[PDB]
UniProtKB/TrEMBL annotation, chains A, B:
It comes from Bifidobacterium longum subsp. infantis (strain ATCC 15697 / DSM 20088 / JCM 1222 / NCTC 11817 / S12). InterPro entries: GH. This is Glycosyl hydrolase. The lineage of its organism: Bacteria, Bacillati, Actinomycetota, Actinomycetes, Bifidobacteriales. It comes from the Bacteria.
């Protein structure tokens, strides 16, 4: 039996991620019941790091128990749960423990004591969550690369070689025979040159590539909210990641996709959802789609970019929105549909000695790789992306189905990403 | 009936200020019972700001209820409670809500939205705590001036005129006919030139001057841990504050005094406690002494400066330490003792047009004002400090009892404070 997973990034209706400071467990049961009734098979859930580990060597066991309870409830309501360990960063807000800031400013990637503490938290949380049948695995943390580089205003500077080791060290805490171990970056991993988190890491470390597809990154602005490029963005990132995966069967998890109203109109979000998913399903390696997010953010909360409030499938009073009905329809259409087949054409990405692009910028919105892929997509050529090494490997190309290659003869950067 | 108050800064034995993430209420009852049995009449308690107000306009009502419960338990165990609203800063750690840091970096003194949110939290917390008979009042927050100036690594720059208005605006939330309203600075208020929190504010805004006396500020280092200057430091700050109080009856609350083992030996702390209090009681305006702190910090917690762990009157297993017995003895000796009388001599501090010292640095450890006062103290002259304006006011001097004035003929700065 084969299938494509459909789920939601769970934003608790009662308190958002401030829920953890005053858990209302009946509200989680109700949230989960309504999510399940959309036809969802999983949730992604987000504990908050300063509550889990308020001192470097003081892990709050009640906070761990609360994560386990939320997982337990998802399972009672018929769904699997995936947990992100270190938040870290959510919806424009940084949540760091006090032992990593100001007078205690630290580097979560480089400092041995911080790394030991991170591993201890992963092990303690994992050891509890592994006891829940609904628990499927963990992602180290949401978009943690946003701490590692400009323009973060208090960055934790690092390097790709250090991140290779840091990722491997934390992923090794999980028994990957029983549970997935994943890591997550924002699209800087694909689009930013000299960024210490890299395409090769994203597409080879951990059990699946995670993608977070957000068309406010210049795609909607540069091509139009009602453009084909806009609805193709998630498919594009999935295919881009395949260029770098050494395992041709590696699953791609569209771990976040949302319909952001800073660039889209509310009335267009159901169609954007359907079209984005229908395009993403053209990727033979697409393992699942997890919508951002389950529930609108309470209008009483301030300082969010306004569109963040409206990203739910359910409104702030718990009632299904038109986009929720659309996502339910897509799950019904695609969860059991046979995976797509091969790809006839590929755009070639020249890579350095480590297998990463010489020019990541050309892969972002407005860039030359991006636009060549978009053109082949519009023409119906079912393009993928391959590296210059793969382009010399007839057997690898045969496995992909690729019989036509397009080179990037005059590369240029991501003019619409940088304008953002 | 007159009396001098004796109490403790309450550090919960079960989790320190991480207690609030998983309250163990039986442990608070036991902590409070043991504190009361030392002969204490009050506690100072510290909620944590990111738990009270995790979003600018999302006040966690359960966190408020937990503060009220802690106050309620203190009262059930026979004691009054004073609450600090915004922590803020505790024992080297900054606890800021995510809406004031990094991508949301804000200025808690200057930004209108932050100030409105602060006032809302004070009003909500005060409205609940006012319903508890044991609640006596609130301090805006512990040593909040540490955010306002160098060397804070992410400071919130401001000015003394703005702080005048900010303090008044927040203090006005309290009904001062029924409860005290106070503010608290570290000793930078007394010792640092050009610092936006000032002696005049400390000694005139709010109902009592709060002093936090810490001999690791250069006093023990420069004069010796076993010196008279070391044990006179709390008295000195009390008398220094009187120079700036326009109300000659204003109470001085020694709101923190501890025996820090980065500069003192463990075996000396009981004698340091007794001698410091016997000297402080020479101040006729001394209203109370609140020891820092009730309970040692659990040895399992890391990144504290090591001496912080040992500042308790009770050890980390709840058992009384020799210093706890000494503090109990001092409370028994002084709680009902008639206040001291007048002061025969005063050192004169030249002041600017606002009434603040021209040279605050000369008032710190190693400074010329500090050392002149210390010399008169050693001689038995019972010195106080007066401003240059008071030194011209025969009636004010008569009220103080002062018949001798000493001017600071060759001022110099606080060489031992700055060396720290």
């Amino acid at each position: 039996m084969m299938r494509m997973r459909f789920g939601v990034n769970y934003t608790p209706s009662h308190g958002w991620f401030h829920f953890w400071l005053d858990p209302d467990w009946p509200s989680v049961k109700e949230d989960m019941r309504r999510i399940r009734n959309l036809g969802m098979d999983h949730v992604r859930v987000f504990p908050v790091w300063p509550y889990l580990q308020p001192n470097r060597t003081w892990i709050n066991r009640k906070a761990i128990a609360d994560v386990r309870r939320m997982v337990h409830i998802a399972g009672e309501q018929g769904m699997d749960a995936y947990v992100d360990v270190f938040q870290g960063h959510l919806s424009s807000f940084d949540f760091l423990p006090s032992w990593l800031v100001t007078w205690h400013r630290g580097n979560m990637f480089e400092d041995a004591d911080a790394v030991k503490a991170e591993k201890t938290l992963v092990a303690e949380l994992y050891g509890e969550l592994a006891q829940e049948p609904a628990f499927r695995g963990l992602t180290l943390g949401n978009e943690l690369n946003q701490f590692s580089d400009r323009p973060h205003p208090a960055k934790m500077a690092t390097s790709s070689r250090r991140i290779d080791a840091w990722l491997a060290d934390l992923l090794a805490v999980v028994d990957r025979r029983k549970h997935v171990a994943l890591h997550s970056e924002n699209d800087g991993v694909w689009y930013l040159d000299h960024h210490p988190f890299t395409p090769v890491q994203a597409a080879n470390l951990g059990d699946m590539t995670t993608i977070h597809s957000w068309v406010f990154n210049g795609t909607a602005q540069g091509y139009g909210a009602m453009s084909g490029e806009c609805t193709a963005h998630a498919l594009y990132l999935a295919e881009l990641s395949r260029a770098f995966a050494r395992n041709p069967d590696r699953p791609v998890w569209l771990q976040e996709v949302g319909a952001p109203q800073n660039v889209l109109e509310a009335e267009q979000t159901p169609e954007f959802c359907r079209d984005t998913i229908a395009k993403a399903a053209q990727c033979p390696n697409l393992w699942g789609v997890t919508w951002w997010c389950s529930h609108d953010v309470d209008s009483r909360m301030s300082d969010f970019p306004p569109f963040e409030h409206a990203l739910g499938l359910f409104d702030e009073h718990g009632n299904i929105k038109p986009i929720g009905r659309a996502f339910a329809e897509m799950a019904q259409e695609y969860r059991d549909k046979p995976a797509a087949g091969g790809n006839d054409a590929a755009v070639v990405i020249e890579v350095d000695e480590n297998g990463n692009p010489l020019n990541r910028g050309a892969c972002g919105p407005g860039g030359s790789i991006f636009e060549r892929w978009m053109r082949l997509h519009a023409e119906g050529a079912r393009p993928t992306l391959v590296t210059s090494a793969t382009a010399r490997d007839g057997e690898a190309l045969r496995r992909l189905g690729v019989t036509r290659l397009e080179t990037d003869d005059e590369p240029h950067g991501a003019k619409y990403y940088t304008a953002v």
